[PDB]
Each structure stands twice: as C-alpha cells, then as structure tokens.
Amino acid sequence: GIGDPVTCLKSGAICHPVFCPRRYKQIGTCGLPGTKCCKKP
Amino acid sequence: GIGDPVTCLKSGAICHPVFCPRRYKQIGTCGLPGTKCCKKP
Numbered sequence: 040g041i042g043d044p045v046t047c048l049k050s051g052a053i054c055h056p057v058f059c060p061r062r063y064k065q066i067g068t069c070g071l072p073g074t075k076c077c078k079k080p
Numbered sequence: 081g082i083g084d085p086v087t088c089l090k091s092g093a094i095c096h097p098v099f100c101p102r103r104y105k106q107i108g109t110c111g112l113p114g115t116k117c118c119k120k121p
C-alpha cells in the first residue's frame with residue numbers, strides 16, 4: 040500500500056502522527072516515524 | 081492561538097507535519113516545531 044508522504048498526499052489523503060483524526064480511516068503510512076496516511080471514506 | 085496537539089484535535093483540526101494540506105487553513109501549531117494545526121473550513 041501507501042508508504043511515502045508524496046503518494047499519500049497525492050491520493051487525496053493526509054499524513055498524521057500516531058493516529059488518524061476523526062472521520063479519517065488509515066490507508067497506509069507516510070514513511071515518517073509513527074505517521075499514518077489517512078483518508079476520509 | 082492553538083499551540084498544543086490536544087487543543088488542536090479537540091477543536092476539529094489536525095496536526096499535520098510541515099504544512100497544512102490543500103483546502104486546510106492553518107490556525108496555529110501543535111506545540112512542536114514543524115507541526116501545523118490545520119482546520120478544514
């Protein structure tokens with residue numbers, strides 16, 4: 040899946056530390072420590 | 081303004097690294113260098 044910050048932000052998603060914020064679901068990582076790639080369904 | 085991660089997330093915003101993603105307004109920081117508190121208008 041997604042594991043780098045460029046692809047994450049180019050896929051309609053955001054990078055967030057630790058956990059994905061409310062209304063976002065985790066779809067991968069952004070390659071940075073403890074950072075998740077997060078997207079609203 | 082908002083300057084800690086708790087108040088940022090409890091205000092309906094996100095702590096995004098480096099910059100606020102497209103369509104998010106920066107409303108402060110999450111207390112750490114390189115974190116922006118970003119809220120969707």
Ligand SMILES: CCCCCCCC(=O)OC[C@H](COP(=O)(O)O[C@@H]1[C@H](O)[C@H](O)[C@@H](OP(=O)(O)O)[C@H](OP(=O)(O)O)[C@H]1O)OC(=O)CCCCCCC
Pocket residue numbers: 044045046048049050051052054069097098099101102
């Ligand atoms: C060169 C300067 C570098 C800084 C530039 C600052 C970057 C900046 O200000 O814009 C954000 C940008 C991506 O945002 P960008 O708007 O381009 O991405 C679009 C967005 O994902 C849309 O949701 C997509 O539409 P859809 O949902 O598919 O329908 C759209 O697809 P398409 O319509 O185009 O096909 C995407 O293009 O981020 C980075 O890529 C790398 C950041 C590095 C990560 C750092 C953060 C950890």
Ligand SMILES: CCCCCCCC(=O)OC[C@H](COP(=O)(O)O[C@@H]1[C@H](O)[C@H](O)[C@@H](OP(=O)(O)O)[C@H](OP(=O)(O)O)[C@H]1O)OC(=O)CCCCCCC
Pocket residue numbers: 056071072073074097098113114115116
């Ligand atoms: C979760 C793990 C990941 C976390 C990663 C951690 C992220 C990371 O470490 O970088 C964030 C940092 C952002 O800077 P940062 O959030 O600290 O914001 C600066 C800070 O507010 C200073 O106080 C300001 O100076 P002053 O008070 O007014 O005197 C300064 O104003 P100015 O100087 O702008 O005028 C602000 O920029 O990076 C960059 O600068 C540009 C892109 C960096 C390169 C990246 C490009 C891809």
